[PDB]
Amino acid sequence: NIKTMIPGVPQIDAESYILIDYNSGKVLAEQNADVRRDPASLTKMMTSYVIGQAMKAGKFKETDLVTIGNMFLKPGMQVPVSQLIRGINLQSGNDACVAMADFAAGSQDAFVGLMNSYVNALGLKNTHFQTVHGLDADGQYSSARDMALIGQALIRDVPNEYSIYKEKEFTFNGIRQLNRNGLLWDNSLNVDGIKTGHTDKAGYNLVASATEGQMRLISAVMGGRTFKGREAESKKLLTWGFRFFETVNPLKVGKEFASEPVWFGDSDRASLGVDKDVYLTIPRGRMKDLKASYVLNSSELHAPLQKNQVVGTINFQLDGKTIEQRPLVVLQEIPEGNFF
């Protein structure tokens, strides 16, 4: 029963936490992951997400200058966008958020409206932002799950913005500022994200992400007890996640997974696979025992068969139990067969 066991979770010294796989979205561990808490500076992930989308859209460059009104910024100061986004991500500067909010949306209210528009665009059911920096507000809240998903969106939708989160330091006005994510300096893990935060109502919060090979995990901890424990507890989850789980990529697009006969077509056989790449998070070491089969929606396949046409379902089995399902599609189209 060593292969088919469910691992016990470590005791995490925080009120809420969640651990997910970046590729497959699988939840490996959770505790009060949907309780609505104060997000503190984790809010700045969404602030960074709004900014990342605008630059990705081309609205402003990282070299553009922003004039201040009205990091210790002063009115009339001209600060490159590059420095303000680093003030947000590395330093957690609340003043840099305000500056970038007026610069990106014209006002803080217009910028909070965008933050909450992406909240709905991501489907978050337990998040609402009242601020651009994350200071405690009566009406703003988030949760460990929603914050783990915001971090996923950062990595997925704006990778150029996300690459900043791994920088250990930046210099503003001749003063070196360190990134507050102390896990970047950990020799045992490969941590390149994401964001720390803390307030009186929120406690000590950390959204972290690490990689081991091509596997990527995202942890979110909220309501942490101490400043140091913030990083220690997140390190507990990530190492635990990598020790007991492995992400595997069994089938990618274009790879033939099965062949079935085709009637009335230009060809006699169809090449069946998947249109979206498959990522499965399984107990580490059980990839050798992973079995895959499939069912068909029809007794026969009739031409014409369009490209990426659904014809059945793939079933991935581990220990005789289906763990994931994906649509089985036609890879190459097959037009109607003609007769001379």
Numbering used by the authors: 4 to 73, 89 to 358
What does the published report state?
The β-lactamase-catalysed hydrolysis of β-lactam antibiotics (BLAs) is of central importance in antibiotic resistance. β-Lactam-based inhibitors (for example clavulanic acid) of the Class A serine-β-lactamases (SBLs) are widely used in combination with penicillins. We demonstrate through biochemical, biophysical and cellular evidence that cyclic boronates are potent inhibitors of both SBLs and MBLs. The cyclic boronates act as ‘transition state analogues' for both ‘serine' and ‘metallo' enzymes and therefore represent a promising strategy for combating antibiotic resistance. The combined results reveal that cyclic boronates act as dual action inhibitors of SBLs and MBLs by mimicking a common high-energy tetrahedral intermediate; they also reveal that cyclic boronates can potently inhibit some PBPs via the same mechanism.
PBP 5 (dacA) from Escherichia coli, which is a non-essential PBP15, was potently inhibited by all tested cyclic boronates (residual activity<1% at 10 μM; IC50 for 2, 1.7 nM). We then carried out crystallographic studies to investigate the binding mode of the cyclic boronates to PBPs, by solving a crystal structure of PBP 5 in complex with 2 (2.5 Å resolution). Comparison of the PBP 5:2 complex structure with reported PBP5 structures reveals that the fold of Domain 1 (aa 3–262) of PBP 5, which contains the transpeptidase/penicillin-binding active site, is very similar in both structures; However, clear differences are observed in the position of Domain 2 (aa 263–356). Importantly, for the PBP 5:2 complex, inspection of the experimental map revealed clear electron density for the whole inhibitor molecule. Comparison of the PBP 5:2 complex with a PBP 5:cloxacillin acyl-enzyme structure reveals similar binding modes for the two compounds in the active site, including with respect to (i) interactions with the conserved active site motifs (SxxK and SxN), the conformations of which overlap almost exactly in the two structures; (ii) conservation of the predicted active site hydrogen-bonding network; and (iii) the same bidendate interaction of Arg248 with the carboxylate of 2 or the C-3 penicillin carboxylates. First, the conserved Ω-like loop that is conserved in PBPs and Class A SBLs adopts a ‘closed' position (that is, closer to the active site) when complexed with 2, compared with previously published apo- or acyl-enzyme structures. Interestingly, in the structure of PBP 5 complexed with substrate-like peptide boronic acid, the Ω-like loop was refined in dual conformations, one similar to that observed in the PBP5:2 structure and one similar to the apo- and the acyl-enzyme structures. Second, compared with the previous acyl-enzyme structures, in the structure with 2, His216 moves >3.5 Å to interact with the carboxylate of 2, which is analogous to binding of the penicillin C-3 carboxylate, implying an important role for this residue in substrate binding.
